[model samples]
Target chain A: MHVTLVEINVKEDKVDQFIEVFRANHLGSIREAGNLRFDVLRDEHIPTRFYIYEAYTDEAAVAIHKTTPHYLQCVEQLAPLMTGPRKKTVFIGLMPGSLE
Target chain B: MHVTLVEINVKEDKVDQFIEVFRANHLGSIREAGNLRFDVLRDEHIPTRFYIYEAYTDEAAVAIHKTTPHYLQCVEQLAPLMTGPRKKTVFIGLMPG
Candidate 1:
């Protein structure tokens, strides 16, 4: 499985709107064929920081994700509200399993 | 916040026992005072592989977790069922708003 963790910090003034847009993106992403998980997380201390945990069946599914309307709209819309570049970590699903 | 992701693989024959033991451990863990999250995840593709997601409010809470009876017992009992060393990933919680 392919998994990714992304961190985004929103502008203080834009945080509320950011949630609405990302929430829709999340719902849409989870409905995709190859998706396994799409979890939304928030920073323990920072009000404007957001985290996204996503998992997919393969690299192809990940690629397809970026092209989807929900993702595209979210990326485009949230860009202006973001405080800086997003941080992302990619890894194999070690906990879930190995070569089955 | 402190977080840890643990990956465990069980002997095919011991999978049922592993589930019973780990599920008990999970239920106990989520009840801890300082716990933020204790999620049990499964491999979409594998049956014998198990994943544990953990988080706590502070480092001190982690020490307390290791001392809990459920943890100690699980460690003692599940050791025999493990196929290999558990894999662990530590992360800071960047999440619920």
Candidate 2:
């Protein structure tokens, strides 16, 4: 399994707009293959903190996700509202007890 | 604020070991500045799946975290036990109103 974490800082006043774009992004293509799960999370302590969780089949699958129309469009629409550049991290997963 | 998500695929038998290394790593330096929150989460629906959420003051703080002894040690010890390469992605966060 592969998981990708995408972090974005949105302008204080633009947060609502940012989530709108995010919602649109989710609705666009997240249901496709390799998209095991995707969720948007907020930080309870930090009013401006946000985290996005995305699980995919593998790196190639994630690459495909970036190329999708919805993702590209969302990026374009949301970039201006960002407080800074986006931070992303990906990981490799091994399921327990599956070694057999 | 910046959040760094580190995803790892551990052998089924090494889940406990992986968490041990993770807890050790957190204990070593997570109390430092910029370490807003650090949590290890399990996929409620997916038994073998896991996720980590880490918040920092900025990218520089996250870099400092990587240089800590605990992080280096954990990485060195845990690499061989990984099922695949460590996939890393960084994000910039925007808070809601």
Which prediction has the highest TM-score against the true structure? Answer: 1
lDDT of 1 by residue, A20-90 (tens): 88788888997899887676777756788877778788889989998999999998897889989999866
Cα-based lDDT for every prediction: 0.79, 0.68
Clash list (residue pairs), candidate 1: A41-B95, A42-B94, A42-B95
Off by over 4 Å in 2: A96-100, B1-97
DockQ of 1: 0.16
Give TM per candidate: 0.58, 0.51
DockQ of each: 0.16, 0.05
Candidate maximizing DockQ: 1
lDDT comparing candidate 2 with the true structure: 0.68
Task: Give the clash total for candidate 2.
Answer: 32
Worst 10 residues of 2 chain A by lDDT: A91-100
